[PDB]
Amino acid sequence: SGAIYVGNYRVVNRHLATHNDWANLVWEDSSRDLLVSSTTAQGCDTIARCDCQTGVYYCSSRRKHYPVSFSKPSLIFVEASEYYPARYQSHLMLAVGHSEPGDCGGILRCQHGVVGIVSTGGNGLVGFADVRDLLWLDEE
């Protein structure tokens, strides 16, 4: 679990969105595994606006933050899960790091700010849904 809280937005994995998220929907994209809802309180996270390929992510199944090198956002085949059939996910970045299904929502960050959230993984890989192209989250 986990979310990004920037301005009056809450960014979560679409597959973990609650009824309250759907009832306060701003934007969602199934191909990216992302959903954004509106918040009453202002958040403290800021979004990175960069092309970094190194950063640090939070792994809830280890209670630890790990440094990672990651690929640029791209279209990658993701195996079937209880949340989606096997399909291509867009704007996804892969890294070598531990992950388990419930690690989704952990933040990946770089020196500039938040880069994205854990969305896919297995067998010593972890995949992150990029948010750096969503300019409307923070200075729009």
Ligand X SMILES: Cn1nc(C(=O)N[C@H]2CCOC2)c2ccccc21
Residues annotated as catalytic are 15, 33, 104
Question: What mask, x for binding Zn ion by CB under 5 A, covers residues 107 to 126?
Answer: ---x-x--------------
By the rule CB under 6 A, 83 interacts with ligand X: yes
By the rule CB under 5 A, 98 interacts with Zn ion: no
Give start and end residues of each alpha helix (H) in 33-133: none
Q: Which is nearer to Zn ion, 16 or 97 (CB)?
A: 97
Q: How far is the CB of 64 from ligand X (least distance, A)?
A: 15
Candidates 55, 25, 21, 38; CA nearest to 132 is: 55
Q: Which residue sits closest to ligand X, CB atoms considered? A: 121
Which residues make up the interface to ligand X (CB under 6 A)?
A: 15, 33, 78, 81, 83-84, 99-101, 103-104, 118-122
Q: Which residues are annotated as a binding site for Zn(2+)?
A: 50, 52, 110, 112
